[PDB]
Amino acid sequence: HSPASGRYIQQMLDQRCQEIAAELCQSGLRKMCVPSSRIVARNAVGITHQNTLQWRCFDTASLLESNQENNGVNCVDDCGHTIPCPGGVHRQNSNHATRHEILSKLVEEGVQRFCSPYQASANKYCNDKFPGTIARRSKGFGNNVEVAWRCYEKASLLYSVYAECASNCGTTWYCPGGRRGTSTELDKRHYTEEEGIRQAIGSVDSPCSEVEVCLPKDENPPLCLDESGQI
Numbered sequence: 001h002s003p004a005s006g007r008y009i010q011q012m013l014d015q016r017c018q019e020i021a022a023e024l025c026q027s028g029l030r031k032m033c034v035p036s037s038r039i040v041a042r043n044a045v046g047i048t049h050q051n052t053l054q055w056r057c058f059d060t061a062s063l064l065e066s067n068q069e070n071n072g073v074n075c076v077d078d079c080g081h082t083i084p085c086p087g088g089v090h091r092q093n094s095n096h097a098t099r100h101e102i103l104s105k106l107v108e109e110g111v112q113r114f115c116s117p118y119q120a121s122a123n124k125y126c127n128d129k130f131p132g133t134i135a136r137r138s139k140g141f142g143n144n145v146e147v148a149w150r151c152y153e154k155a156s157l158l159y160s161v162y163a164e165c166a167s168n169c170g171t172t173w174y175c176p177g178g179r180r181g182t183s184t185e186l187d188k189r190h191y192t193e194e195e196g197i198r199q200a201i202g203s204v205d206s207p208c209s210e211v212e213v214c215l216p217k218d219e220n221p222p223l224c225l226d227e228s229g230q231i
């Protein structure tokens with residue numbers, strides 16, 4: 001068991017999308033008659049004139065290997081933030097079903113189960129200061145070694161790259177959505193906030209008593225074990 005996000009919200013969205021595709025197939029929608037391996041949930045633009053980010057059930061066979069670059073697809077972390085995932089929408093040829101309401105509801109429900117209150121606090125600090133940003137302890141511009149707590153514009157993160165985030169005990173954890181420390185323009189889109197983010201994390205009340213040891217888990221609540229006596 002790794003100290004890492006299980007990406008449980010994304011898993012649930014993919015499974016729900018697999019069920020929806022199967023239901024559309026039964027309704028006669030031929031292009032939705034596929035094995036489950038072909039269907040994922042992504043938050044993205046759609047076909048032409050579908051220009052808002054919405055939760056949609058995509059056939060992966062219709063996705064483009066690259067985006068360029070307003071047509072990227074986004075996956076979701078376990079605190080419900082959308083982050084760039086591999087691939088792009090084909091604006092003419094996409095095979096998808098927009099299901100924004102049900103998929104958004106599943107995200108909201110999942111956040112309660114899976115989002116570390118310590119991470120939620122760090123994310124809130126960042127969004128309050130820099131709207132749209134989330135917290136990670138990760139790389140900056142043109143330095144692929146140094147990590148620091150920063151408020152990152154979500155578009156600058158990579159879902160396939162894990163980066164440090166706060167566990168539900170306020171201890172080291174790793175979450176999808178990280179930086180490579182490359183030197184692209186996107187690599188600039190962050191605001192380093194060591195003091196403010198650490199304070200946000202430090203301000204969270206423990207799920208355990210002062211007489212218990214917090215052992216973090218990939219779901220809330222963490223384990224609170226009775227502290228060992230002067231045995």
Ligand SMILES: CC(=O)N[C@H]1[C@H]([C@H](O)[C@H](O)CO)O[C@@](O[C@H]2[C@@H](O)[C@@H](CO)O[C@@H](O)[C@@H]2F)(C(=O)O)C[C@@H]1O
Nearest residue numbers: 140141148150151153187188189190191192193194
């Ligand atoms: C340009 C951008 O979107 N973000 C840059 C930010 C940003 O301008 C400031 O954080 C706004 O207050 O600055 C970065 O560089 C920082 C950083 O090196 C810190 C270390 O604490 O020291 C400051 O003097 C630098 F401006 C940042 O926050 O990382 C670079 C971002 O691209």
Ligand SMILES: [Cl-]
Nearest residue numbers: 005077078175
């Ligand atoms: Cl996560």
